[PDB]
């Protein structure tokens, strides 16, 4: 939180002018209610007197009062317009300045700052918190000021027309204030009604639905739905008392409102029988002051909004005002004119800003000569993009030096540094633009001639020029409408048009084939003239095109020198060379286990929308018992009415408590059902559904933790909202039509123009809502683009282009907001001012009626108030609502998530259950290419089989079908060109659950939930209790009890999320057990033990051959120390079995 006078610091002279004039006409919108009263006082006295003596002088006097009314209504037309308009405009300027400068400093801010933050958070922030601040500074403040204005105006205008009554009433005033403040905090705080309690269960509905492999691999889809319950329950356990609290508080709040009207009516009915005041005069005081403190009550949601703002703007303004050390946009430093590619890395030390505990550079010695190449190569995935992101200063080796031409890398300007170097990124890193405009991102000023020179200067012609309109055919998001060779190679041309002085490669041509290499390695090594190139190689094809060979070893460089002189040196490369809708009826049937709650709740609601016609008939009587004569019996009736008010006080205590508590617990019921139903039927799918982007981890979790609550709303909150607003305008329209229909008609005419201001002040999107969602997404697409793939933007130093596109797309939300402000100021002002013109025309027509015989003032003041305030009440109730038609989309989503039938339905008994699964597979010509990555073949012709009790192992390149065959035997997917059958019998006929009982797996990446370790390791067999000694037998078996006996909490400590409260060596041998519980048959230790030191591991294959007998084994591991106990041998060659 930052304080009232810093959240406004982005205001220009004309802003302060809009705010100041919007504030003085806020204050002058305010005092418009009291003066309406003052004339209401004098017209009440005129009516009661004149009709009491029996005269069209009444009509001409009511005329003059109609002018005072209309005049004040036009005054409020103008002052409401100016209030809302200028306040929204001042927020528009301030918020686009905040937005532009936010983006500017979200790019200027470092990269490690994106080790800290994830980009879903950041895009929420940039589209959610900015609209929080827009709410805060936008218009909340103008209506807050108009509230406090009319408060003081009622105060001051009671005093000036009676001071006793004003004192007795200003006495209770805190009561009506705090009361309307709670009645108006409730009908908002419902919609959200969430702090951080659900999170106790959401933690597991998220972490254990993002680790959905280990949760399918082991049948454990009940030890993750049960626990989900046993936290939803313990959330219910407090949600109950808190619904009790909220509804007792609203019951009280109306008990105090009605006690207040009773006190005030007694007192101010004694002062009017000793003739001190008058009917009108007494009204003026109470009504001015009551609506004063009611309108100060009902601005508790606005005083909440302003603080939501202040608390968002704290974190936005602090993101902005940081000056990250390595300043992209800075001019600090020197820039030379003659630069050579003599690069050196000496005693550098870069520890990560997130995970500083994995040290990967521990004192280097790397030297290069101007022009000639190098060779930075090593084992698979050994952290070498480090070198590709430490020179362009994305990060900083803290205690070292990156020497370029006798200088350190820091005293160079960064905007000039990252300009003289260009790279080819390991995975082709495209910006979502056409080819030509993909390339201009290299230098921003590159014309046709150089485009062609640099696109053919590496043979990048045919595969681009085949498809038409080459430079308007767009290429795909994340690499979606182009291939692995048509896309990758282009990353040489762009980062060439830069005309570099050094160029770099992170395995530029890993997925570039032989003839592709024979047409690229020319541009690759004809590149050098006097400039360096830093090679990170994968193959052994052109590493020989070098004079230097620098190896990777324990974070310390070891080998260097020429090829022949080093063939005797015994280095490291020495080894390398050898949605459908769903009706109302269906969302209502979703919970028919509560007919009683909806019945009691809805009859309560019908007995709360009827308090308004109650008031209407009550002070229809009051205007008749306060006539002339009989002053002795006039004090009797007013005491009966003090009483009546008290009794409805207590009734509505009980009616409001019931209504609330009833629909609150029915909502909670429906919510817990929907949550657990969705989560069950969301562990019941294949993994051909949980890899997509329509179904992320946070997408699913969003649907759980938000669409449940919203369908909860839309089921029966609408039932109430309709029952009230039927018994409230319905009953009032009915009564009004019984008593006087002519004036009722004239007021129905206006009802739509009065019940709009209440919904506008907290709607502000009517012909704009979907519009806002559209224009802001279409302008933030660039935000998202440059915000996700940001190593490249910040690596090309091609961010100012993205910034300026951002700006010129913001120019759309800006004229949107301007026409928004102006048409919404107009609708708000005309609704408001039509209230006063309502008083005027209604009472003029009324006085005509009265002097015609067609009515009687007691009835004109029944009708007027019944209808006008059924209207304002419809406003207040409607504008306090959860957006039914929003959560009907939640309804449709949830339903479609229920019904889907996964062809790998794990929750089915249909199938064949053999008894002794002999540890045999039978793979007759199996093939499978990814379903969504539809074409890249990971398995293009294979055939295997293991024998019962034998061992085998597969070794090769990065991911060449080592794992993607496991997803075929675990039967996540059904292979399309092939036929899987186990033990000689075919799979698809097998029961799928049984199938995942005999089959054991362990993980190259073993992961554990947020639980103790009584359960965590027992997981491996649900459908039977896992004993205690079973867990410890495994612990000695898995060779983890050699270290288990250290934990102060031996077997019951609370471990974190998916390898958090563990180490890199520990978990390598923990998942051993979580499948060794079922006593499976087929072991798949896919590098399950890789980070265990040599001292602790090899013993793993001792308790796993004196027991491994009686069952088979498959292996995927790069451990030459154990590969050599094979029986059958099958090898990768181009993803084929030779």
């Amino acid at each position, epitope marked *: 939180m930052i304080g009232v006078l810093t959240l406004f610091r982005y205001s220009d002279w004309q802003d302060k002018l809009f705010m100041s004039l919007g504030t003085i006409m806020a204050i002058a919108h305010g005092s418009g209610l009291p003066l309406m009263m003052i004339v209401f006082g004098e017209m009440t006295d005129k009516f009661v007197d004149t009709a009491g003596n029996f005269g069209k002088i009444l009509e001409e006097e009511m005329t003059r009062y109609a002018y005072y009314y209309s005049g004040l209504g036009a005054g409020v037309l103008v002052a409401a317009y100016i209030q809302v308009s200028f306040w929204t405009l001042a927020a528009g300027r301030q918020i686009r300045k905040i937005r532009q400068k936010f983006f500017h400093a979200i790019l200027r801010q470092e990269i490690g700052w994106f080790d800290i933050n994830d980009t879903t958070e950041l895009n929420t922030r940039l589209t959610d918190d900015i609209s929080k601040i827009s709410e805060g500074i936008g218009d909340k403040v103008g209506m807050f000021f108009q509230a406090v204005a009319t408060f003081f105006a009622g105060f001051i205008v009671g005093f000036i027309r009676g001071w006793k009554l004003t004192l007795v009433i200003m006495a209770i005033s805190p009561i009506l204030g705090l009361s309307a403040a709670v009645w108006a905090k409730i009908l908002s705080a419902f919609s959200d009604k969430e702090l951080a309690a659900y999170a106790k269960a959401g933690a597991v509905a998220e972490e254990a639905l993002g680790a959905i492999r280990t949760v399918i691999a082991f049948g454990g889809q009940n030890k993750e739905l049960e626990r989900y319950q046993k936290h939803l329950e313990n959330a219910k356990e407090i949600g109950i008392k808190k619904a009790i609290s909220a509804n007792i508080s609203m019951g009280i709040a109306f008990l105090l409102i009605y006690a207040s009207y009773a006190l005030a009516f007694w007192y101010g009915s004694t002062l009017v029988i000793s003739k001190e005041y008058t009917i009108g005069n007494a009204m003026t005081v109470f009504f001015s002051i009551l609506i004063g403190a009611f309108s100060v009550g009902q601005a508790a949601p606005c005083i909440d909004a302003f603080a939501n703002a202040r608390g968002a703007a704290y974190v936005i303004f602090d993101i902005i005002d940081n000056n990250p050390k390595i300043d992209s946009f800075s001019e600090r430093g020197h820039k030379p004119d003659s630069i050579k590619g003599n690069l050196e890395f000496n005693d550098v030390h870069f520890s990560y800003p997130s995970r500083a505990n994995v040290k990967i550079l521990k004192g280097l010695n790397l030297k290069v000569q101007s022009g000639q190449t190098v060779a930075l190569v090593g084992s698979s995935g050994c952290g070498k993009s480090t070198t590709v992101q430490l020179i362009q200063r994305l990060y900083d080796p803290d205690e070292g030096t990156i020497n370029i031409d006798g200088q350190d890398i820091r005293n160079f300007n960064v905007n000039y540094l990252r300009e003289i170097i260009g790279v080819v990124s390991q995975e082709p890193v495209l910006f979502s633009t056409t080819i030509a405009e993909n390339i201009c991102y290299g230098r921003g000023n590159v014309t046709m001639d150089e485009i062609k020179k640099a696109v053919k200067e590496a043979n990048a012609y045919e595969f681009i020029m085949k498809l038409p309109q080459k430079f308007d055919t767009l290429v795909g998001e994340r690499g979606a409408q182009l291939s692995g060779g048509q896309k990758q190679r282009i990353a040489i041309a762009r980062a060439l048009v830069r005309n570099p002085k050094i160029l770099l490669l992170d395995e530029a041509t890993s997925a570039l084939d032989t003839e592709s290499e024979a047409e690229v390695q020319a541009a690759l090594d004809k590149a050098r003239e006097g400039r360096t190139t830093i090679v990170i190689a994968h193959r052994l094809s052109t590493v020989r095109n070098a004079d230097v060979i620098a190896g990777f070893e324990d974070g310390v460089i070891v080998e260097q020198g020429s090829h022949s002189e080093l063939m005797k040196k015994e280095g490291v490369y020495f080894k390398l060379v050898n949605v*459908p809708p769903v009706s109302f009826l*269906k969302v209502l049937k979703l919970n028919k286990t509560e007919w009683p709650y909806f019945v009691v709740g809805t009859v309560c609601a019908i007995a709360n929308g009827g308090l308004q016609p109650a008031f209407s008939v009550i002070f229809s009587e009051i205007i008749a018992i306060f006539g002339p004569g009989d002053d002795a019996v006039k004090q009797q009736k007013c005491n009966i009415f003090s009483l009546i008010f008290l009794f409805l006080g207590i009734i509505s205590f009980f009616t409001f408590f019931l209504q609330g508590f009833t629909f609150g617990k029915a909502g909670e019921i429906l919510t817990r059902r929907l949550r657990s139903m969705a989560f069950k039927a969301m562990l019941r799918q294949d993994m051909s559904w949980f890899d997509d982007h329509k179904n992320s981890t946070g997408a699913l979790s969003t649907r759980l933790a938000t669409d449940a609550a919203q369908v909860q709303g839309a089921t029966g909150t609408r039932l109430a909202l309709i029952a009230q607003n039927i018994a409230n305008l319905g009953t009032g329209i009915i009564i009004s039509f019984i008593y006087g229909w002519q004036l009722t008609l004239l007021l129905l005419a206006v009802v739509p123009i009065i019940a709009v201001s209440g919904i506008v002040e907290m709607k502000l999107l009517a012909g704009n809502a979907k519009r806002d969602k559209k224009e802001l997404e279409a302008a933030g697409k660039i935000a998202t683009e440059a915000i996700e793939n940001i190593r490249t933007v910040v690596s090309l130093t091609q961010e100012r282009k993205f910034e300026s596109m951002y700006v010129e797309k913001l120019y759309g939300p800006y004229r949107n907001s301007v026409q928004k402000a102006h048409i919404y100021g107009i609708t708000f002002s005309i609704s408001q001012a039509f209230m006063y013109f309502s008083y005027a025309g209604c009472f003029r027509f009324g006085a005509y009626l009265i002097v015609n015989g067609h009515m009687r003032f007691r009835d004109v003041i029944l009708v007027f108030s019944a209808i006008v305030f059924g209207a304002v009440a419809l406003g207040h109730a409607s504008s306090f609502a959860p957006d039914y038609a929003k959560a009907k989309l939640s309804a449709a989503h949830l339903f*479609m998530l229920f*019904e889907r*039938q996964p062809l790998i339905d794990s929750y089915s008994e*249909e199938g064949l259950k053999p008894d002794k699964f002999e540890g045999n597979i039978t793979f007759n010509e199996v093939v499978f290419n990814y379903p969504t990555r539809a074409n890249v073949p990971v398995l293009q012709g294979l055939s295997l089989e293991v024998k019962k009790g034998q061992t085998l192992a597969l070794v090769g390149s990065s991911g060449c079908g080592k794992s993607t065959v496991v997803q075929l035997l675990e039967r996540f997917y059904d292979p399309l060109a092939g036929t899987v059958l186990l033990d000689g019998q075919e799979a698809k006929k097998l029961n799928v659950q049984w199938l995942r009982a005999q089959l054991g797996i362990v993980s190259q990446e073993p992961i554990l939930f947020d639980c103790s370790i009584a359960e965590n390791i027992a997981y491996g067999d649900n459908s039977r209790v896992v004993s205690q000694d079973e867990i410890v037998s495994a612990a000695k078996a898995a060779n983890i009890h050699p270290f288990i006996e250290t934990l102060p909490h031996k077997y019951e400590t609370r471990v974190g999320d998916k390898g958090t409260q563990l180490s890199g060596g520990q978990k390598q041998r923990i998942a051993i057990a979580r499948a060794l519980i079922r006593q499976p048959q087929i072991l798949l230790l896919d590098e399950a033990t890789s980070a265990l030191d040599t001292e602790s591991e090899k013993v793993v294959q001792e308790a796993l051959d004196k027991a491994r007998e009686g069952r088979t084994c498959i292996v995927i591991a790069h451990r030459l120390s154990t590969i050599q106990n094979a029986d059958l041998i099958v090898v990768f060659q181009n993803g084929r079995v030779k």
Partner: antibody
Amino acid sequence: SEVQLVESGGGLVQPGGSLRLSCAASGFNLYSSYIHWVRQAPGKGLEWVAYISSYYGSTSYADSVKGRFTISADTSKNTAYLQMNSLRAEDTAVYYCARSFSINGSYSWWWDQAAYGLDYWGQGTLVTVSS
Amino acid sequence: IQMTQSPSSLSASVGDRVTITCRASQSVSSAVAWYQQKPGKAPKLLIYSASSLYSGVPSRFSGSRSGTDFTLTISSLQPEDFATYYCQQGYSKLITFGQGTKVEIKR
């Protein structure tokens, strides 16, 4: 396109076993009109057996098969699934997927449940109940 | 809630009034359909709610409703006729199809 109701699954099992009458409805979406299952007794006549209106969530099974048949409208991948259980003796009739009527074509409504005729049909697979 | 054909096994001639009377349930209230199934297939729709005729269908099927009576008279009987009928009732959450009839060629 044309109203096509194509069938998979079912046909061969002992009495006392499940069958999955799957009915891909191509030409339209499941959620606009009713999808009954119907019965051709072995040269005896036809019969309604069940239906699922999947824009109201409503279902109904026949008096002789109550408790054994669970329909579902897999209306994200546009199929109608029918789970049958225990398949007792007199279930050797040929079961078809039938579509009820629409007064307009772009919707059906819960009022007048399939009273304006069975305007479209398909050909299902034969089934048998024997050891 | 059931359907009862009167004229089973129609065996009359080609070119004359041949008519079917299938008596309905208690309160069917004009909710009948009349269906032509050819052998070995699934039926067609001809008339629904006792009066209105399907489209792309020959207009030689005359339907009448006399209170609790639904009557189907065909008089042309081209070679494509002489196949099974069905009178099926769908009402009050239950539907039952009639024990279908058969139009024969007369010899």
